[PDB]
From a paper:
In the case of morphine, there are multiple cellular adaptations that contribute to the development of analgesic tolerance following chronic exposure. NMDARs are ligand-gated ion channels that are activated by the binding of the co-agonist neurotransmitters glutamate and glycine. Overactivation of GluN2B-containing N-methyl-d-Aspartate receptors is thought to play a key role in mechanisms underlying cellular adaptation that takes place in the development of analgesic tolerance. Herein, we describe a novel GluN2B-selective negative allosteric modulator, EU93-108, that shows high potency and brain penetrance.
Once we established that EU93-108 is GluN2B-selective, we next wanted to confirm that this compound binds at the ATD interface of GluN1b and GluN2B, in the same pocket as ifenprodil, EU93-31, and other previously published GluN2B-selective NAMs. To ascertain the binding site and pose for EU93-108, we utilized protein crystallography and X-ray diffraction to solve the structure of the isolated GluN1b-GluN2B ATD in complex with EU93-108 at 2.85 Å resolution. The crystal structure revealed the binding site of EU93-108 at the GluN1b-GluN2B ATD heterodimer interface, which is similar to that of EU93-31 and ifenprodil. Specifically, the binding site involves residues from GluN1b and GluN2B ATDs, especially around the α3 helix from GluN1b and α2′ and α6′ from GluN2B. The sulfonamide group of EU93-108 forms polar interactions with the backbone amides of GluN2B-Met207 and -Ser208. The phenyl group, the piperazine group, and the difluorophenyl group are in van der Walls contacts with residues such as GluN2B-Pro78, -Phe176, -Pro177, -Ile111, and -Phe114 and GluN1-Phe113, -Ile133, and -Leu135. EU93-108 has similar sets of polar interactions as EU93-3167 but not ifenprodil. The van der Walls contacts are similar between EU93-108, ifenprodil, and the backbone of EU93-31. EU93-108 was tested at 10 μM and inhibition of GluN2B was approximately 18-fold higher than that of the other NMDAR subunits, confirming that it is selective for GluN2B. As anticipated, EU93-108 was also an effective inhibitor of human diheteromeric GluN2B receptors (h2B/h2B) with an IC50 of 260 nM (197, 347 nM 95% CI; n = 10) and with a residual current remaining at 10 μM EU93-108 of 12% (8.5, 16% 95%CI; n = 10).
Author numbering:
A (entry chain A): 23 to 97, 102 to 186, 209 to 407
B (entry chain B): 32 to 394
Write the structure that this text describes.
């Protein structure tokens, strides 16, 4: 007679479902479970947003889950899960979603994630501008949420060493950007930072080729999106970009996420007057009373010995101490030249070569 | 003329007959096309109830649009309907209750329109009041409830372009997604000096804020709170934590009654589809199923939106804002009196505030 406590998940595949059950199984062993004992409940992504929202109700909230884990769908979004769960104030944990929008508490009020948003790449840029004493940078940005996200996050780090001599924004969809790029040429700053989708970076990459702005002189510093798929195809040689380490290992993040959540469950039932979440959607319109506290507990969990590193959340419930590979395009091969360990840059013995040749 | 399906959803005990009787003008529809309305009743307003219901209706019948009314203080219904609207590409009009409560940032694909003031309309109104009674020093409290930045932005935008001399002391932001066992909302609230206080949040959030603001002496005399429509919500329900002398804007069921609203809902959907058949020789086909909106999506758009926003009927201007609000609604200022009753105290029309009192009597 321990109290059974359900944790839910919506995951890519059945293998991932089995990984999730196992992770919970092992949390029960690892932990002292006379009082409370977790139980895994799961489904995979439904084919559209409406069935997704009904499945959360039918399959998960009917089992009175205390929290819901959510992978990003393969080849559809976490949004209907955030929404449906958010209605009751059941916490949602994103395993693989990097879009910045989910850091907005007005939309996504019960959402944490074990991967950082894309906007947090600005931390790594900043630390590199210190390390490689780039004090004067031009900043090119897609006028969409994801682009503005990144701008704000850097400007915080600049605006209270380095400084941004201008910030240019373009309308996602534009292919002739030589209006914009001519504006970046006439400035004295040679370092260029881009936040753009895969297709928008493609557009930029060519327009900037055409103005010989890809040549020696110039440093190009970029994120993961802008060295993926077709952005990689037309990218200048010497570019520097990022790859979140394990950022797509759903299985790894299932592991760490279960670990954190089980910790936080056990810490929650140290407290008094803990109410159960609602059993099912139907006829249930009041929030879960304890959902906002459980959120607080999670939000200030620390797991230091995690498969993906050191688990902590910032105030938005985004992952902190995420690690990235620093990637340099040399002879149209993407080479790791360094890593961000979560706080420190660590150069490796592979030498960087910049646009031009640069020794 | 050919018949389009319209569903009318009513949540909570309903003058079902007075509504059926105010669409007595079935032969008031001389357009290209004629409504086939079908009243539905719902007992429940959770996400599942609403979705399965509207989706059943969609795969029983051929629904061109939905008119939704409820009796709840449940601003989430607005969000749920928006989502449904955008997923299924389907006009939903939220005419009353939760359905009409401000939903800031609807989808790009939404066909969801609400009867009610915009956030900005109400923020404006709130300044005309404070002008009138020459209240010029004031602070703002909000939560993260969507629209909070639109609110502070319309305020700030207005006061910093003003021959008048406004003096916004403080602007607060309260995080109610996290629990308050450390008294952080307390601390942030003590910080307040101002005589006036604009409060942007939900009715549920308000009750707690006020419970807190009370115990730190901010509901006393020489503090006036002003709140938007959605904090008053349903005026026949008045939480005890609400302080007396609270002021609110309101498009609750005052002059514009539910059956009127239903009738104009059906008007708007029918005339908008009329004008689109009349100018394109087709209207968009009701979606067989919402259990297949993934595939049938190149085949759909929210084309009908341009015709929904610009309607008149029996020569009344029923235009919608581009945010899917009502363009010019007659708002009613209201005051919580000493018997704990929302009493009218003002009427906003032809963009002109028209108060009852000259000075405020004391409750
Ligand atoms: C700091 S404060 O306490 O966070 N205030 C605050 C902030 C944001 C709030 O709502 C934001 C939302 O979008 C939440 N909603 C929940 C309901 N919703 C939804 C939509 C479609 C569904 F199908 C469904 F099931 C649920 C959509 C998302 C409400 C209150
Ligand atoms: C993903 O993570 C798991 C650790 O849980 C590991 O077994 C596997 O090697 C990883 N896969 C890749 C491609 O790194
Ligand atoms: C809604 O409640 C009414 C009144 O009791 C009832 O007649 C109707 O069958 C109910 N609908 C459902 C779906 O339970
Ligand atoms: C809206 O209505 C009237 C005529 O129907 C006209 O003044 C205006 O051009 C219309 N606007 C449109 C079609 O955008
Ligand atoms: Na979050």
């Amino acid at each position: 007679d321990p109290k059974i406590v359900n944790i839910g998940a919506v995951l890519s595949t059945k293998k991932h479902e089995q990984i999730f059950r196992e992770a919970v199984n092992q949390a029960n062993k690892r932990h002292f479970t006379r009082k409370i004992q977790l139980q895994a409940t799961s489904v995979t992504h439904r084919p559209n947003a409406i069935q997704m929202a009904l499945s959360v109700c039918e399959d998960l909230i009917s089992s009175q889950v205390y929290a819901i884990l959510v992978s990003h769908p393969p080849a559809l979004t976490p949004t209907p899960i955030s929404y449906t769960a958010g209605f009751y104030r059941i916490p949602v944990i994103g395993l693989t979603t990097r879009m910045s929008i989910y850091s907005d508490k007005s939309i996504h009020l019960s959402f944490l994630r074990t991967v950082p948003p894309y906007s947090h790449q600005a931390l790594v840029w900043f630390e590199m501008m210190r390390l490689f004493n780039w004090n004067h940078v031009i900043l090119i940005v897609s006028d969409d949420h994801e682009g503005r996200a990144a701008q704000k996050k850097l400007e915080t780090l600049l605006e209270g060493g380095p400084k941004a001599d201008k910030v240019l924004q373009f309308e996602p969809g534009t292919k002739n950007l030589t209006a914009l790029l001519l504006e970046a040429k006439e400035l004295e700053a040679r370092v260029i930072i881009l936040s753009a989708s895969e297709d928008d970076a493609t557009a930029v990459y060519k327009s900037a080729a055409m103005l010989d702005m890809t040549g020696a002189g110039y440093v190009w510093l970029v994120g993961e999106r802008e060295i993926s798929g077709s952005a990689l195809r037309y990218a200048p040689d010497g570019i520097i970009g990022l790859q979140l380490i394990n950022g797509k290992n759903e299985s790894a993040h299932i592991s760490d996420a279960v670990a954190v959540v089980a910790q936080a469950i056990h810490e929650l039932f140290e407290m008094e007057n803990i109410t159960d979440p609602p059993r099912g959607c139907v006829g249930n319109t009041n929030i879960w009373k304890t959902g906002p506290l459980f959120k607080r507990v999670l939000m200030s969990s620390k797991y230091p010995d995690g498969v993906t590193g050191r688990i902590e959340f910032n105030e938005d419930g985004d992952r902190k101490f995420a690690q990235y590979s620093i990637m340099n395009l040399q002879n149209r091969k993407l080479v790791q030249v360094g890593i961000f360990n979560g706080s420190y840059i660590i150069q490796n013995d592979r030498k960087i070569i910049w646009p031009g040749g640069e020794t | 003329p050919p018949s389009i399906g319209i569903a009318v959803i009513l949540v909570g005990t309903s003058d079902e007959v007075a509504i059926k009787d105010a669409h007595e003008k079935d032969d008031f529809h001389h357009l290209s096309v004629v409504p086939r309305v079908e009243l539905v009743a719902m007992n429940e307003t959770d996400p599942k109830s609403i979705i399965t219901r509207i989706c059943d209706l969609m795969s029983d019948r051929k629904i061109q649009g939905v008119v939704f009314a409820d009796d709840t203080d449940q601003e989430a219904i607005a969000q749920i309907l928006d989502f449904i609207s955008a997923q299924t590409l389907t006009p939903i009009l939220g005419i009353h209750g939760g359905s009409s409560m401000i939903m800031a940032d609807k989808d790009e694909s939404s066909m969801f329109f609400q009867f009610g003031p915009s956030i900005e309309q109400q923020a404006s109104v709130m300044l005309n009041i404070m002008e009138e009674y020459d209240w010029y020093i004031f602070s703002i409290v909000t939560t993260y409830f969507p629209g909070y930045q639109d609110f502070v932005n319309k305020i700030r935008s207005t006061i910093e372009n003003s021959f008048v001399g406004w003096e916004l002391e403080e602007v607060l932001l309260l995080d109610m997604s996290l629990d308050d066992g450390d008294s952080k909302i307390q601390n942030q609230l003590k910080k307040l000096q101002s005589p006036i206080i604009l409060l942007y949040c939900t009715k549920e959030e308000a009750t707690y804020i006020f419970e807190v603001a009370n115990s730190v002496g901010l509901t006393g005399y020489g503090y006036t709170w002003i709140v938007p429509s959605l904090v008053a919500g349903d005026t026949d329900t008045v939480p005890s934590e609400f302080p007396t002398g609270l002021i609110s804007v309101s498009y609750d069921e005052w002059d514009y009654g539910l059956p009127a609203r239903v009738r104009d809902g059906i008007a708007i959907i029918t005339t908008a589809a009329s004008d689109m058949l009349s100018e394109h020789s087709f209207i968009p086909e009701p979606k067989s199923s919402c259990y297949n909106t993934h595939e049938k999506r190149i085949y759909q758009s929210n084309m009908l939106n341009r015709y929904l926003i610009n309607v008149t009927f029996e020569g009344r201007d029923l235009s919608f804002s581009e945010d899917g609000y009502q363009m010019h609604p007659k708002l009613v200022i209201i005051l919580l009196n000493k018997e704990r009753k929302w009493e009218r105290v003002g009427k906003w029309k032809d963009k002109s505030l028209q108060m009852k009192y000259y000075v405020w009597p004391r409750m």
